[PDB]
Amino acid sequence: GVLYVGSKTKEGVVHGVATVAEKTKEQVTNVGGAVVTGVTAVAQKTVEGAGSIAAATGFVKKDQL
Amino acid sequence: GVLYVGSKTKEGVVHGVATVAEKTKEQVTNVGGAVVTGVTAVAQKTVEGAGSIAAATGFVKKDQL
Amino acid sequence: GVLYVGSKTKEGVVHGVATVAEKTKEQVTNVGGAVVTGVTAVAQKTVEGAGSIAAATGFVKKDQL
Amino acid sequence: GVLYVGSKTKEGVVHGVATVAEKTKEQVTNVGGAVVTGVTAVAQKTVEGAGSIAAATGFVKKDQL
Amino acid sequence: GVLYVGSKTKEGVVHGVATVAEKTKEQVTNVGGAVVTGVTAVAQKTVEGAGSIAAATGFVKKDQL
Amino acid sequence: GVLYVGSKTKEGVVHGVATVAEKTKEQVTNVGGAVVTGVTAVAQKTVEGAGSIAAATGFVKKDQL
Amino acid sequence: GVLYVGSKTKEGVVHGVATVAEKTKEQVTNVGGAVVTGVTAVAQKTVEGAGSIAAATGFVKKDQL
Amino acid sequence: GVLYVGSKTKEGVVHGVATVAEKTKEQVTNVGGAVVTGVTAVAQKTVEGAGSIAAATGFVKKDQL
Amino acid sequence: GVLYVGSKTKEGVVHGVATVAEKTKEQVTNVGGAVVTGVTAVAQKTVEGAGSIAAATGFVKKDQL
Amino acid sequence: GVLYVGSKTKEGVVHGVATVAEKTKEQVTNVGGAVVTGVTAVAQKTVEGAGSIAAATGFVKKDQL
Amino acid sequence: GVLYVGSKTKEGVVHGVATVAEKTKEQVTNVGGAVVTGVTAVAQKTVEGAGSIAAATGFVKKDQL
Amino acid sequence: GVVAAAEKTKQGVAEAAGKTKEGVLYVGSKTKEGVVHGVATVAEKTKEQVTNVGGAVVTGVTAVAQKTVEGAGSIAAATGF
Amino acid sequence: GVVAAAEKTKQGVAEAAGKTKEGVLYVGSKTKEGVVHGVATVAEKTKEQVTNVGGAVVTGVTAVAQKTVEGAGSIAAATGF
Amino acid sequence: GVVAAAEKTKQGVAEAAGKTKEGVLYVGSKTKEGVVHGVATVAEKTKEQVTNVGGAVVTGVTAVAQKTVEGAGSIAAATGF
Amino acid sequence: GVVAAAEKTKQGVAEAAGKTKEGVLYVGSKTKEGVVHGVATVAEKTKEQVTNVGGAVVTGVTAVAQKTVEGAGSIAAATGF
Amino acid sequence: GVVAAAEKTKQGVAEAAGKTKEGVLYVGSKTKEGVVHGVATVAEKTKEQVTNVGGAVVTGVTAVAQKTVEGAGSIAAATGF
Amino acid sequence: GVVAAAEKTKQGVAEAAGKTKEGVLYVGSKTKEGVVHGVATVAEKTKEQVTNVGGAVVTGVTAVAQKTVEGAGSIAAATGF
Amino acid sequence: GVVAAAEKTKQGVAEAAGKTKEGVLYVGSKTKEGVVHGVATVAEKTKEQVTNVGGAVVTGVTAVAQKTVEGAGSIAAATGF
Amino acid sequence: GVVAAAEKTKQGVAEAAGKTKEGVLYVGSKTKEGVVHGVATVAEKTKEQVTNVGGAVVTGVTAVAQKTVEGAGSIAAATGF
Amino acid sequence: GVVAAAEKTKQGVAEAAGKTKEGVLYVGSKTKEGVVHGVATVAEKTKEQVTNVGGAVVTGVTAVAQKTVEGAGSIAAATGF
Amino acid sequence: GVVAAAEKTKQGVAEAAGKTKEGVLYVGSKTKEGVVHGVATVAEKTKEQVTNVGGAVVTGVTAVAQKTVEGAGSIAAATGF
Amino acid sequence: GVVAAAEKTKQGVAEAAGKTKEGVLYVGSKTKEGVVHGVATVAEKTKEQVTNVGGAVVTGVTAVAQKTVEGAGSIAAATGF
């Protein structure tokens, strides 16, 4: 007996990201690491699993077992 | 007997992120680490799992077991 | 017998983040650590799981078991 | 017998964050730690789980068991 | 027999955070610790779990069991 | 028989935080500790769990069992 | 038989915090402790749990069992 | 007895990302690490699996078992 | 008894990504690492599998078993 | 008893990516690594398989077993 | 009893990618690595198989067993 | 006097221009003028009656993109002398 | 006097231009003028009656992209003297 | 006197321009003028009657993008002398 | 006298410009003029009657983006002498 | 006399400009003029009657974005001599 | 005499400008002029009657963004001589 | 005489400007002019009657953003000679 | 004579400016002019009657953002000679 | 003679300015002019009657943000000669 | 003669300015002009009658933010000759 | 002759200024001009009658923020010759 007349739904949504860079100097030297200087939009609905990285930006993982 | 007439719903939503950089000097030297200097929008609805990083930005993980 | 006529709902939402940087000098030297100097918007609805980091920004994790 | 006519609801919402930096000098040297100098907006609705960090910004975790 | 006609509700909401920095010098040297000098807005509705940090900013955790 | 016509409700809300810093010199040297010099707005509705830190800012935790 | 016509309610709300710093010199040296020199607004509605810190700012915890 | 008349649904969607760079100098030297300076939009609906990275940007993974 | 009359559905969709670069100098030297400076739009609906990277951008993986 | 009259469906779709580069100098020297400076749109519906990279852009994989 | 009258369906589709480069200087020297500076649109519906790369762009794979 | 020069290089480009006027670029843009999109309707019984005498009647789903220069533009026009 | 020069190079390009005027570029653009798109309808019984005497009647799903210069543009026009 | 120069380089670019005028760029932009989008309707019984005598009637879902220069623009016009 | 120079570099760029005038950039922008969006309706019985004599009647869901220069713009116009 | 110079560098950029005038940038912006959005309605019985004689009547959900220069703009106009 | 210089550097940038005039930037901005948004309604029985003689009547949900230069702007206008 | 210089550096930037005039920045801003937002209504029985003779009547939910230069702006206007 | 200099540094920036004029910044600001927001109503029976003869009547929920330069601005105007 | 200098530093910044004029900053500000917000009403029976002859009547929930320069501003105006 | 200098430092900043004029800052401020907020009402029976002849009547919940320069501002105006 | 200097420091800042004029700062401030806030009312029976002949009547909940320069400001004005 359910009805959907014109309904909307947003689950795990990235919407409307605006970015402007004008005349920006930028100098990076990197040795064995992560350097992030840009736009990163991640939209997910379901992430299941033990010990799992669902969204990583600028990540360094060096584990011993 | 449910009815949805024009209804809206937002669950786990990133909406309307604006960023401007003008004439910004920026100098990074990095050795084995994480340096983040940008925009990062993450939208998720469900993340399940033991010991899981759902959203990491500028993360250094060096564990011993 | 439920009715939704024009209803709205926001659960776990990041909305309207504005950031401006103008002529900002910035110098970073980093050795094995996390340095975050940018925008990070995270929207989540459900995060379940034992010992899980739901949202990390500038995180250093070095554990021994 | 419930009715929602034009109703609104905000649960776990970050709304309207504005930040301006103009001509701000900033110098960081970091060794094995967390330094955060940016905007971080986190919106969550439900976080369940024993011993879990729901929102960390500038976090250093070095535990022995 | 419940009716919601134009009702509003805010549960766990961060709304309207404004920050301006103009010509602010800032120098940080950090060794194995947490230094936070930025905006951090966290909105949560429910956090359950024994021994869990619901919102940490500038946190140093070094425990022995 | 309940009716909500134009009602409002705020439970666990941070609203309207304004901060301005102009020409403020600031020098920090930190060794293994927490130094916080920024804005931090935290809004939560429910936090349950034994021995859990619901909101920490500038926290140093070094416990022995 | 309850009616809410235009009613308001604020439970656990932080509203209208304004802070200005102009030309303020500030020098911090910190060794293994917590130093807080910024704005921190925390709004919570319910915090339950034995031995739990509901809101900590500039906290040093070094316990032996 | 379900009906969908004009309904919409967005689950795991990245929508409307705009980025402009004008006259921006950028210099990168990188040795064995990850440097990201561009736009990255990721939309996913379901990611299941133990120990799996659902979305990585600027990731360095060097593990020993 | 289900009916879909004019309904829409978006599951794992990347929509409307715009990027402009004008007169941007860019110099990269890279030795054995990943440097990403372009647009990357990834849309996926289902990714299952243990220890699988669902979306990697600027990834360095050097593991020992 | 299902009917689809004018319905739409998008599952794993990349739609509407626009990119313009005008007068952009770009110099790359690369030794044994991955450098990506272009547009890459990937749309997938199902990816199953243990230890499989579903979408890689700027990837360096050098594993020992 | 199913009917499809004018229905549409898109599963694993890349649609509408536009790219313009005008007067862009570009110089690449590459030794044993992958350099990608062009458009790459990949649309797939099903990819199954253990340890298989479903979509690689700018990939370097040098494994020892 | 626009002069460009590269010397003793392994990959050199020397570009010079005297006077430039760039044009318009439409890259992925969209435009809609007089468009009807997405009209869903579920009715058990439908009835539509029009009784017109000496006039102009326009019904149904109509989209019009009409341009005129030296004349009267209209959608439904009735004129009598 | 536009001059470009490359010397002692392994891959040299020397480009010079005196005067340039770029044009228009339509790359992937779309345009719609008077378009009807996506009209779904589910009706058990449909009935449509038109009774017209000496007039102009336009019904149904119609899309018109009409351009006129020195004349009266219309969709349905009725005129009597 | 615009002069650019690169020397003793491994990857050199030397760009010089005298006078520049960039143009317009539409990159992913959208425009809507007179658009109807998303009209859902669920009715058990529908009835629509129009009785027009010597006039102009416009009903239904209509979208009009109308431009005129030296004439009277309208949607429904009735004139009698 | 605009002069740029790079020397003894491994990756050098030398850019010089004399006079510049940038243009407009529309990157992901949207514009709506006379738009109807999202009109949901659930009715058990619907009835619509129009009885027009010598006049102009406009009903239903209408969106108009109308531009005129030297003429009278209107949506429904009735004039008698 | 604008001069830029880089020397003995591993990654050098030397940029010089004499006179600059930047333009407008619309990056992700939105604009709405005469827009109706989100009109939900649930009615068991609906009835709408219009009885017009020699006048102009505009009803329903209408959005108008109307621009005029040297003429009278209106939505419903009735004039008699 | 604007001069910039970098020497003996591993990553040097030397930028010089003589005269600059930045423009406007619209980054994520929104604008609404004459907009109706979110009109919910639940009625068991609805009845709407209009009886117009020689005048102008505008009802329903209407949004108008109207600009005029040398003419009388209005929404409903009735004039008699 | 604006001079900037960096020497013996590992990451140097040398920026010089002679004269600067920054512009306007709209970053995430919003503007509303003549907007109706959020009109909820629950009525069991609704009745609306309009009886207009030779005048101008505007009812319902209306939002108008009206600009005029050399003309009389109004919403409902009635004039008789 | 504005001079900036950095020497013997590992991360140096040398910035010099001669004359500066910053502009306006709208970052997250909001503006409302003539706005109706949040009008809830619960009525069992509603009745609205308008009987207008030769005048101007404006009722309902209306929001107007009206600007005029050389003309009389009004919402409801009635004039007789 | 503005001079700045940094020497023998590991992270040096040398900033010099000759003359500065900062502008306006709107960061998170709000403005309301002619706004109606939050009008709740619960009535069992509602009745509204307007009987207007040759005058101007404005009722209901109205918000007006009206600006005029060389004309008479009003909300309801009635004038007779 | 403004001079700043830092020497033999590990994190040095050397800032010099000659003449400064800061501007206005609106950070989180609010402004209300002609605003109605929060009008709750519970009535079992409501009746409102207006009988207007040749005059101007304004009733209901109205908020007006009206600015005039060289004209008579008013809310309800009646004038007879 | 403003001089600042730091030497042999691990974190040094050297700031010098010649002439300064700070501006205005609005940080979290609020302003209200002509505002009605919080009008609660519980009535079993309500009756409101207005009988106006040739005059100006303003009733109900009204808030006005009115500014005039060279004209007569008023809320209700009646004038006869």
UniProtKB/Swiss-Prot annotation, chains A, B, C, D, E, F, G, H, I, J, K:
The record lists Cu cation as bound by H15
Q: How is it modified after translation?
A: Phosphorylated, predominantly on serine residues. Phosphorylation by CK1 appears to occur on residues distinct from the residue phosphorylated by other kinases.
Q: What is the effect of changing Y4F?
A: No effect on osmotic stress-induced phosphorylation
Q: What is the effect of changing H15Q?
A: In PARK1; no effect on protein structure; no effect on phosphorylation of the protein; no effect on membrane- and lipid-binding; increases oligomerization; increases fibril formation; increases secretion of the protein; impairs copper-binding
Query: Residue span of the signal peptide, if any?
Result: none
Query: Residues where Phosphoserine occurs?
Result: S52
Q: Where in the cell is it found?
A: Cytoplasm; Membrane; Nucleus; Synapse
State the sequence repeat positions: 7-21, 22-32
Q: Which residue stretches belong to region 4 X 11 AA tandem repeats of [EGS]-K-T-K-[EQ]-[GQ]-V-X(4)?
A: 1-32
Domain of life per record: Eukaryota
Consequence the record notes for mutating E11K:
In PARK1 and DLB; significant increase in binding to negatively charged phospholipid liposomes; increases oligomerization
- Where is it made, tissue-wise? Highly expressed in presynaptic terminals in the central nervous system. Expressed principally in brain.
Subunit info? Soluble monomer. Homotetramer. A dynamic intracellular population of tetramers and monomers coexists normally and the tetramer plays an essential role in maintaining homeostasis. Interacts with UCHL1. Interacts with phospholipase D and histones. Interacts (via N-terminus) with synphilin-1/SNCAIP; this interaction promotes formation of SNCA inclusions in the cytoplasm. Interacts with CALM1. Interacts with STXBP1; this interaction controls SNCA self-replicating aggregation. Interacts with SNARE components VAMP2 and SNAP25; these interactions allows SNARE complex assembly and integrity.
Disorder named in the UniProt entry: Genetic alterations of SNCA resulting in aberrant polymerization into fibrils, are associated with several neurodegenerative diseases (synucleinopathies). SNCA fibrillar aggregates represent the major non A-beta component of Alzheimer disease amyloid plaque, and a major component of Lewy body inclusions. They are also found within Lewy body (LB)-like intraneuronal inclusions, glial inclusions and axonal spheroids in neurodegeneration with brain iron accumulation type 1.
Comment text on domains: The 'non A-beta component of Alzheimer disease amyloid plaque' domain (NAC domain) is involved in fibrils formation. The middle hydrophobic region forms the core of the filaments. The C-terminus may regulate aggregation and determine the diameter of the filaments.
Q: Give the family, as the similarity comment puts it.
A: Belongs to the synuclein family.
The entry's function note states: Neuronal protein that plays several roles in synaptic activity such as regulation of synaptic vesicle trafficking and subsequent neurotransmitter release. Participates as a monomer in synaptic vesicle exocytosis by enhancing vesicle priming, fusion and dilation of exocytotic fusion pores. Mechanistically, acts by increasing local Ca(2+) release from microdomains which is essential for the enhancement of ATP-induced exocytosis.
Q: What is this protein called?
A: Alpha-synuclein
**Underlying gene:** SNCA
Q: Parent protein range shown?
A: 36 to 100 of 140
